[PDB]
Amino acid sequence: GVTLFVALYDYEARTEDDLSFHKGEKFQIVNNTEGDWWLAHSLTTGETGYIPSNYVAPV
């Protein structure tokens, strides 16, 4: 299987390249090797975009 990630804190994106999200939302990771912003898909909202890796933790 896979490892999902959960938001630890709310985050308001400044660009549509990034996701806005709320604490407790869950993500699948699309790409985590290019830098500390990870391309992710929100299972909670259905959106795909970058998330800051310091705002999430593995479930």
């Binding site: 290019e34 830098g35 500390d36 391309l39 970058y50 310091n54």
Partner: peptide, 12 residues
């Protein structure tokens, strides 16, 4: 920088 390599936000 690329989107992936931008500075991270501070913790809230």
């Amino acid at each position: 920088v690329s989107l992936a390599r931008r500075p991270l936000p501070p913790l809230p």
